[PDB]
Amino acid sequence: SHTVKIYDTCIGCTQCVRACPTDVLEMVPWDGCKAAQVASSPRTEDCVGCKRCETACPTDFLSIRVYLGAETTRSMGLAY
Amino acid sequence: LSGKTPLFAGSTGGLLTKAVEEEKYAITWTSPKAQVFELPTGGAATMHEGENLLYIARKEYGIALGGQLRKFKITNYKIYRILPSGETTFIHPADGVFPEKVNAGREKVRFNARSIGENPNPSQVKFSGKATYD
Amino acid sequence: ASFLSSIFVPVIGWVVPIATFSFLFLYIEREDV
Amino acid sequence: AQAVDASKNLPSDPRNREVVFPAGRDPQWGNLETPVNASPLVKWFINNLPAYRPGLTPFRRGLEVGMAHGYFLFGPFAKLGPLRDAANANLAGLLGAIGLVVLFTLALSLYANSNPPTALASVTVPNPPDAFQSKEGWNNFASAFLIGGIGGAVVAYFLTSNLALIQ
Amino acid sequence: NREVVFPAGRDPQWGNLETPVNASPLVKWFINNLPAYRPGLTPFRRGLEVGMAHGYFLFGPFAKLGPLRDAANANLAGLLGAIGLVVLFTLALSLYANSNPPTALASVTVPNPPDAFQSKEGWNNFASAFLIGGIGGAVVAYFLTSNLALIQGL
Ligand code: CLA
Ligand code: CLA
Ligand code: CLA
Ligand SMILES: CC1=C(/C=C/C(C)=C/C=C/C(C)=C/C=C/C=C(C)/C=C/C=C(C)/C=C/C2=C(C)CCCC2(C)C)C(C)(C)CCC1
Ligand SMILES: CC1=C(/C=C/C(C)=C/C=C/C(C)=C/C=C/C=C(C)/C=C/C=C(C)/C=C/C2=C(C)CCCC2(C)C)C(C)(C)CCC1
Ligand SMILES: CC1=C(/C=C/C(C)=C\C=C\C(C)=C\C=C\C=C(C)\C=C\C=C(C)\C=C\C2=C(C)CCCC2(C)C)C(C)(C)CCC1
Ligand code: SF4
Ligand code: SF4
């Protein structure tokens, strides 16, 4: 449905993965020798576009972005 | 899925016709003490002494409930996805470690090595099926 | 000649909407188009 | 002290008996069993209505449904419609009432052709209602609504117009 | 411009030819969605809609052109005469139904098998509905024409 893109400016705050209500994000180890970790977006079907992660990321401009796209039952948050 | 349902009289807010037809969810957790906890949708309920189970409409309700369980110091919250055919999948944690703590088995996905400002202009990728963020 | 208005007004207000909405509703609810 | 204060906790108190229950045994479900929803009186009435009555054909259901509505819809057009004070007042009600039945039957067959999802089950009607889960059942229901609706309106027209002769 | 007429299907061996009248977009919809071919209907509903169309059609010739057309009971003759013709039409169906009718054919305009007219039951249920709808269509046409002056008089 949506597309959550994670850019190079991450620093491993782990704030995005916590703020996500639907657990769309995950912190994975980066192949960078001195880079501790980096975020990920493995289960993007469950994104609900609430943009909490964009509010959490403390970079000058956000390392993470949520681009709106094709909607569905899960993305629109319809229990019915 | 094995567990005792929390004791509550019932509520208008809860499972709907979507549950039978489309992907009802279920959350599982084990409690040390029987305590009163607010339900995800209206009201209060009493969790049992061990192996509680609750059927849930959306995945958001389960994780929202898990944050409340952490106030009671219950961190073993498990969520499943129940299709109409009965297929149950260990959905929320794919591996035993939580999403916050790093694990070697995971792999980065949808990672853009460029900076956000280095994205191309949309005029460069018009009439191609490509998107700027990709 | 004034009898034309007695036949053209109602079909515009009733027949044309019923035909358009009925076709459009079945068209949008179709599974394969 | 009064005994009413002491008995508030006991289950023998008429207070503590609870009328409301969860839908079925599962409390997670949406509905709540209430005396309006789950009483034997209401369950008997709703389940035995033509839309839910057991062992009836789809054509028989719409005829019973249409004959009621046709007989009902004659009233508003006659007494309160235009030309209510005139010799042809009752006649205008017969045409206007049949007009809705045609529009109503159109919506039925129109809703029928669009694949209807399902007929839902609730506390008042636990079983699935009928074979209203297909185009064939809804289409026969529509044709029956038309016949009964035209007949019911004629009946109300005959009785209402010839009421003085009946007196 | 190029050819408009094609063979039925891919095979040219078969008789039928694809033509505008046979295989146009408009004609295929009308014929296939007529009650005799419309999908999702039972045999009873098909006969009802067919009869209802025919009773309304057959009332006219008897009334405005039959004997006593220039009389007070003109419109009444059309209703009774049409019903007698509908009954014969109903009787014909029962004979064609009760004589083991072979099959229904599939042409280019109706490519799929047309309907469940492949048995005695489908035709018999068709006949019962023809009489019900057939008599109804004539009774409707009688009350309108007889009371058309009133309906305009309103
Ligand atoms: C634009 C087209 C259009 C036309 C031509 C009409 C025409 C009419 N409307 Mg109407 N209407 C329209 C749009 C239209 N409406 C819209 C958009 C709305 C929504 C706001 C309404 C809301 C509306 C109301 C709320 C009412 C009308 C009524 C009427 C009738 C009143 C005539 C009169 O003076 O007294 C009556 C004069 C008569 C000669 C008796 C009329 C008898 C009816 C019209 C016979 C109809 C038979 C019908 C064709 C059967 C249908 C079946 C068929 C499809 C097979 C008249 C026929 C009034 C009414 O009661 O009509 C009965 C009325 O109460 N209309
Ligand atoms: C605004 C809506 C409306 C109107 C105008 C009417 C008008 C009429 N109805 Mg009626 N009805 C209605 C709604 C309406 N009803 C509803 C909602 C229902 C279903 C609950 C019915 C069920 C019904 C039946 C079963 C019968 C009628 C009959 C009649 C006619 C009585 C004869 C007459 O002319 O006496 C003069 C009329 C009046 C001075 C005014 C109306 C008086 C009637 C008796 C009112 C009855 C309806 C009732 C009070 C509605 C409340 C229901 C609610 C508690 C659920 C009259 C034309 C009878 C009939 O066919 O006539 C021969 C008949 O047998 N109606
Ligand atoms: C074949 C030519 C022919 C024609 C046209 C007529 C015409 C007529 N005869 Mg007659 N007659 C004929 C030969 C003919 N006769 C012969 C050969 C004899 C000697 C046996 C008689 C003996 C005779 C008698 C003794 C009487 C008549 C009477 C009548 C009249 C009433 C018809 C009636 O009720 O039928 C009803 C007809 C139908 C129910 C069917 C109509 C079929 C329609 C028109 C089909 C239309 C098809 C449509 C256009 C196509 C659809 C296309 C689709 C894609 C939309 C009418 C003027 C009566 C009368 O009094 O005359 C005034 C009368 O009593 N006739
Ligand atoms: C008390 C009560 C109530 C009330 C009730 C009511 C008010 C009822 C209704 C009423 C109605 C609503 C009625 C109606 C009836 C009707 C009728 C009576 C009909 C008739 C019909 C006929 C008879 C027809 C026939 C025909 C046909 C079908 C076709 C052809 C033609 C003819 C005409 C033959 C209720 C339930 C709410 C609730 C509970 C209690
Ligand atoms: C344009 C065109 C066309 C034309 C058309 C036409 C011409 C039409 C026809 C017409 C017709 C042909 C019509 C008819 C109709 C009918 C009706 C309208 C019916 C009615 C019915 C009823 C309503 C009934 C009911 C009932 C019953 C059933 C039983 C009991 C009684 C009663 C009455 C209730 C065509 C297609 C050719 C071709 C193309 C184009
Ligand atoms: C549309 C169509 C078509 C076509 C058709 C046409 C075009 C025509 C037809 C035609 C016809 C098919 C005709 C018929 C006619 C008939 C007649 C002409 C008859 C008459 C009769 C009479 C006149 C008699 C009377 C009576 C009765 C009924 C009973 C009692 C006694 C009396 C004698 C009274 C087809 C098939 C392809 C297909 C389907 C669709
Ligand atoms: S910069 Fe944003 S995406 Fe990267 S670790 Fe911090 S909060 Fe997560
Ligand atoms: S919009 Fe943001 S907070 Fe919401 S699911 Fe997507 S990434 Fe997580």
Q: What is the 3-state secondary structure (H, E, C) of chain B?
A: CCCECCECCCCCCCECHHHHHCCEEEEEECCCCCCEEECCCCCEEECCCCCEEEEECCHHHHHHHHHHHHHCCCCCEEEEEECCCCCEEECCCCCCCCCCCCCCCCCCCCEECCCHHHCCCHHHHCCCCCCCCC
Residue D22, both tokens: 């969860």
Separation between Cα atoms, residue D88 and residue D107, nearest integer Å: 29
Q: Which helix (H) or strand (E) holds D99?
A: helix D89-113
DSSP code of A1?
-
Instruction: Look at ligand 8, atom 4, and give the residue with the nearest C-alpha.
Output: A50
Q: Is D110 helix (H, G, I), strand (E, B) or coil?
A: helix
Give how far A44 is from chain B: nearest CA, Å.
10
Separation between Cα atoms, residue E130 and residue E91, nearest integer Å: 10
* D3 CB-near residues (< 8 Å, 6+ apart): none
Ligand with minimal distance to E85 CA: 6
User: How many other C-beta atoms can be found within 10 angstroms of the C-beta atom of residue E113?
Assistant: 13
DSSP code of D29?
B
- Report the residue among D72, D100, D154, D166 best suited for mutation to probe ligand 2: largest number of ligand atoms under 8 A from its CB: D72
Q: Which residues of D touch E42 (CB under 8 A)?
A: 136, 139-140
Cβ contact, residue pair C22, D110, below 8 Å: yes
Q: Angle formed by the axes of helices D135-161 and E43-65, to 10°?
A: 40
Evaluate whether A66 touches A8 at the Cβ level (below 8 Å).
no
A44 inside 8 A of chain B by CB: yes
Evaluate whether E90 touches E47 at the Cβ level (below 8 Å).
no
Evaluate whether A56 touches A3 at the Cβ level (below 8 Å).
no
Residue D40, both tokens: 């034997």
Cβ contact, residue pair B13, D30, below 8 Å: yes
Evaluate whether B39 touches B45 at the Cβ level (below 8 Å).
yes
Length of chain E: 154
Evaluate whether E55 touches E49 at the Cβ level (below 8 Å).
no
Length of chain D: 167
D127 inside 8 A of chain C by CB: no
Strands B88-90 and B77-82: what pairing? antiparallel
Neighbours of chain A (3+ CB pairs under 8 A): B
- Chain CA centroid to CA D29, Å: 25
Q: Could you give the residue ranges of the DSSP H alpha helices within chain E?
A: 20-23, 25-33, 43-65, 74-97, 120-146, 148-153
Evaluate whether E132 touches E51 at the Cβ level (below 8 Å).
yes
Closest chain D CA to residue B16: D30
Evaluate whether D135 touches E40 at the Cβ level (below 8 Å).
yes
Separation between Cα atoms, residue D139 and residue D116, nearest integer Å: 11
Separation between Cα atoms, residue D39 and residue D2, nearest integer Å: 35
Separation between Cα atoms, residue D12 and residue D10, nearest integer Å: 5
Cβ contact, residue pair E154, D113, below 8 Å: no
User: How many other C-beta atoms can be found within 10 angstroms of the C-beta atom of residue B91?
Assistant: 19
A67 has which bridge partners?
Answer: A3
Separation between Cα atoms, residue D73 and residue A80, nearest integer Å: 34
Cβ contact, residue pair E150, D88, below 8 Å: yes
Give how far B28 is from chain D: nearest CA, Å.
14
B112 has which bridge partners?
Answer: A7
Pocket of ligand 2 (CB under 6 A): D 72, 75-76, 78-80, 156, 159-160
Handedness of CA B102, B108, B111, B114 (dihedral sign): positive
Residue B80, class by beta-carbon neighbours within 10 Å (0-12 exposed, 13-18 middle, 19+ buried)? Answer: buried
- Report the residue among D46, D74, D155, D162 best suited for mutation to probe ligand 4: largest number of ligand atoms under 8 A from its CB: D155
Q: Which helix (H) or strand (E) holds A19?
A: helix A15-19
Separation between Cα atoms, residue B56 and residue B1, nearest integer Å: 13
Length of chain A: 80
A54 inside 8 A of chain B by CB: no
* Residue of A25, A14, A26 whose CA lies nearest to A48: A25
Separation between Cα atoms, residue B115 and residue A63, nearest integer Å: 8
Q: Is A35 helix (H, G, I), strand (E, B) or coil?
A: coil
Ligand with minimal distance to D65 CA: 4
At residue E145's C-alpha, the angle toward residues E144 and E147, to 5°, is: 65
Q: Is A50 annotated as a binding residue?
A: yes
* B95 CB-near residues (< 8 Å, 6+ apart): B103, B105, B106
Backbone angles phi, psi at D76, to 5 degrees: -60, -35
* B105 CB-near residues (< 8 Å, 6+ apart): B95
Max Cα separation, chain E?
63
Evaluate whether A62 touches B128 at the Cβ level (below 8 Å).
no
